[PDB]
Structure 1
Amino acid sequence: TSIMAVTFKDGVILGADSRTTTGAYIANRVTDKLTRVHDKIWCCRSGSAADTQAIADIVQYHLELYTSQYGTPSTETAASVFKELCYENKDNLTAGIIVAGYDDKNKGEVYTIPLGGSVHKLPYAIAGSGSTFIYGYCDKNFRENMSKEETVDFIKHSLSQAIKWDGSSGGVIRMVVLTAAGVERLIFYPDEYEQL
């Protein structure tokens, strides 16, 4: 798995590959790892698929019930609910989640929640097995307040390399753009990104 969330001028973009493996067999080559917990709060899932789905489903439930009572939750609030589940059940979970969301007040925010259940607010985040291969690349090439087109290229180039070196990563590059304008889904196929 290669997943990342990147803040930029207009908001935030989440990116992911589409490969799910059982050992060396690819169980699903068109997986959707970008998952919606609220209108403009999404997350990228890594680790146990069962665990991250079970968590994400519970968070979606909590934020739906939050919205009914208190109105739209902040991205920080969503990250806190993810954290609370991950931290309190750390002995029984293998979940590495990146939370990304768009407020109008706070604009684009990214929170990463690694195995322990700690929270870390960051300008951008990378995670999953394929992320190890792009720490160098992402650190050198990330800038703050990029445009939409620059951020799409940054994610596309980054995950292209993650896919290239990681056997556990592959397939299509899915992306989800979160701005004031709304929610845009993007897809990029092997024939496009491999030749970069």
Structure 2
Amino acid sequence: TSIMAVTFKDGVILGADSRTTTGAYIANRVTDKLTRVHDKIWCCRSGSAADTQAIADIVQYHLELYTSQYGTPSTETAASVFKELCYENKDNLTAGIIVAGYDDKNKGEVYTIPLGGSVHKLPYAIAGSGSTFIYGYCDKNFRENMSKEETVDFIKHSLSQAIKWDGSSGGVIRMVVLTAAGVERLIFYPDEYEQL
């Protein structure tokens, strides 16, 4: 996998490739790694497909039950539920998850949860096998309070390089935009992003 989430002026954008692999065979070339745990709290999934799905399903259940009792949960709260699962079951889990959400008070927030189960709140986060190849690029090119179009270009260019170098990443570049306006899905095909 190659995944990332980036905060910007109006909120936050999640980005991901669409490749799922069994060894060197691509089991699914159109995977959706950006998944909803709440209306405006989503996550990026890397690592085991089974583990990350199982985890995401449980978190969605917890946040739905939270909402029924206490109203809309914070993005921090969602990240805490992910952490609790990943930390307490670290011996049996292979999951690298990036949690991203939009509050009206807190605006765009991004939390990353690596293998250990630790939590790290960041302006932007990158993860997955293909993220190694774009640490240099992303660090040099990231700016705070970017516009929507700039952030889309930042993610597109970044994941394009991650895909280009990582054999474990490829297919389409999916994105999900989280703002006050609502939830917007974006897709970008090889013919566009490859020749960037």
* TM-score range relative to shorter protein: over 0.9
Q: Distance in 2 between matches of 1:31 and 1:75?
A: 24
TM superposition shift of 1:90: 0.3
Q: CA deviation at 1:87?
A: 0.2
Distance (whole Å) between structure 2 residues aligned to residue 163 and residue 82 of structure 1 = 27
Shift of residue 178, structure 1, vs aligned partner: 0.0
Distance apart, 1:3 and its partner CA: 0.1
Q: Once the 2 structures are TM-superposed, how far is the Cα of residue 58 of structure 1 from its aligned partner?
A: 0.1
Q: Write the distance in 1 (CA, Å) between the matches of 2:15 and 2:48.
A: 18
**Residues of 1 paired with 2:63 and 2:28: CA distance?**
29
Q: Deviations over 1:91-145 (max 9, x none)?
A: 0000000000000000000000000000000000000000000000000000000
Per-residue deviation, residues 20-56 of structure 1 (Å, max 9, x unmatched):
0100000000000000000000000000100000000
- Structure 1 Cα separation of the partners of residues 91 and 23 of structure 2: 23
Map 1:1-196 → 2, pairs under 5 A: 1-196=1-196
Shift of 1:11: 0.1
3-state secondary structure, aligned to 1:106: coil
1:134-191 alpha-carbon deviations (Å, 9 max, x no partner):
0000000000000000000000000000000000000000000000000000000000
**In structure 2, what is the Cα distance between the partners aligned to 1:91 and 1:189?**
37
- Cα distance in 2 between the residues matched to 1:194 and 1:48: 26
Q: Secondary structure at the match of 1:98?
A: strand
Q: Give the SS at the match of 2:146.
A: coil
How many Å separate the matches in 2 of 1:131 and 1:194? Answer: 17
Share of identical aligned residues, percent?
100
Aligned length: 196
Instruction: Describe the superposition over 1:37-89 as per-residue Cα deviations: whole angstroms up to 9, x where unpaired.
Output: 00000000000100000000000000000000000000000000000000000
Structure 2: state its 5+ residue gaps: none
Q: What is the Cα-based RMSD across aligned positions, in Å?
A: 0.2
* SS state at 1:131 partner: helix
Contiguous gaps of at least 5 residues in structure 1 = none
Q: Distance in 1 between matches of 2:41 and 2:114?
A: 18
* SS of equivalent to 2:115: coil
Helix, strand or coil for the counterpart of 1:118? coil
Mapped to 2, the partners of 1:11 and 1:130 lie a distance apart of 25
